[PDB]
Design a protein around this ligand. Structure first.
Ligand code: HEM
Length: 291
């Protein structure tokens, strides 16, 4: 496969900035979801799961085809609970029927991060919806019950190196695990709908204790009321990952700069951009626009 980026016919910066402004305004408004966490967390988890099925060996999966729209990928056990992020974005697609699915799912994520006071993520348009038979089979997204060797081996299929994996995993400060979705339960820190380096600081400063939960799975619990997945706790069991964790815990700007770069890379894997194509867009936030 080659998947060439094709701009939605006739659209420019300002059209895209209007879909962003509309996702951000609905984030403002539906602020009660998940005990007042808001939809920002489930929207960045949707943008990483439509991108994470990519395989570098044969160019299949990835954000291009918008294939989550199909039953097979939608009903994937690893995608439980994302139906909420889909439902949120659905009125927005009716308001802007020209944007592709891959471009909408992926800009949902960019919008959520920047509105949650995260860094600016450059975003590129051009994904083209592809047929139901391009839909990747289930089982390409990662297990939580595993160690640092699995994490490193997994992220190599998406060719992410160590620093990229540690920066990408800093998004687990956001939101929470939920027992009926994934067999895991609990939040990862205090500020779970603001984007900060809190995940690293909690991983280095809490007294974590291994316990089984109501699903019969293990997780790392702390006195404070927080949890960490086995795969999250892996980042301090590996000496290479641990020097990176410490760096971000001492420097939130360096974390913002590396998350920005790696999140964009994750959203654009498997896509070729012609150089006639527009430069990546930097969208303004509501606040920046006085809205
Ligand atoms: C080895 C890697 C990863 C594993 C095993 C993993 C697994 C999980 C699991 C089990 C949950 C809880 C789902 C639920 O019950 O609702 C979760 C939540 C979440 N994940 Fe990951 N994750 C990984 C990587 C990432 C990456 C790379 C990102 C983002 C760039 C990410 C973002 C999120 C977000 C934002 C949530 C919170 C969702 C919510 O509040 O509903 N994850 N993760």
């Amino acid at each position: 496969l080659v998947h060439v980026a094709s701009v939605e016919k006739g659209r420019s910066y300002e059209d895209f900035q209007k879909v962003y402004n509309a996702i951000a305004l609905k984030l403002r408004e539906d602020d009660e979801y998940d005990n007042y966490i808001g939809y920002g967390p489930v929207l960045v988890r949707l943008a990483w799961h439509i991108s994470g099925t990519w395989d570098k060996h044969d160019n299949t999966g990835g954000s291009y085809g918008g294939t989550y729209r199909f039953k097979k990928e939608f009903n994937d056990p690893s995608n439980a609970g994302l139906q909420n992020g889909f439902k949120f974005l659905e009125p927005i697609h009716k308001e802007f029927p020209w944007i592709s699915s891959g471009d909408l799912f992926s800009l949902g994520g960019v919008t959520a991060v920047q509105e949650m006071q995260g860094p600016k993520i450059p975003w590129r348009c051009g994904r083209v919806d592809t047929p139901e038979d391009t839909t990747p089979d289930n089982g390409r997204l990662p297990d939580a019950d595993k160690d640092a060797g699995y994490v490193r081996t997994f992220f190599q299929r998406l060719n992410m190196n160590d620093r990229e994996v540690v920066a990408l995993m800093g998004a687990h400060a956001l939101g929470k695990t939920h027992l009926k979705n994934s067999g895991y339960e609990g939040p990862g820190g205090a500020a779970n709908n603001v984007f900060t380096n809190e995940f690293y600081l909690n991983l280095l400063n809490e007294d974590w204790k291994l316990e089984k939960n109501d699903a019969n799975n293990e997780q790392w619990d702390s006195k404070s009321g927080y949890m960490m997945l086995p795969t999250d706790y892996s980042l301090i069991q590996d000496p290479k990952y641990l020097s990176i964790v410490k760096e971000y815990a001492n420097d939130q700007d360096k974390f913002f700069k590396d998350f920005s770069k790696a999140f964009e890379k994750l959203l654009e894997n498997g896509i070729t951009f012609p150089k006639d194509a527009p430069s990546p867009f930097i969208f303004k936030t509501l606040e920046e626009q006085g809205l």
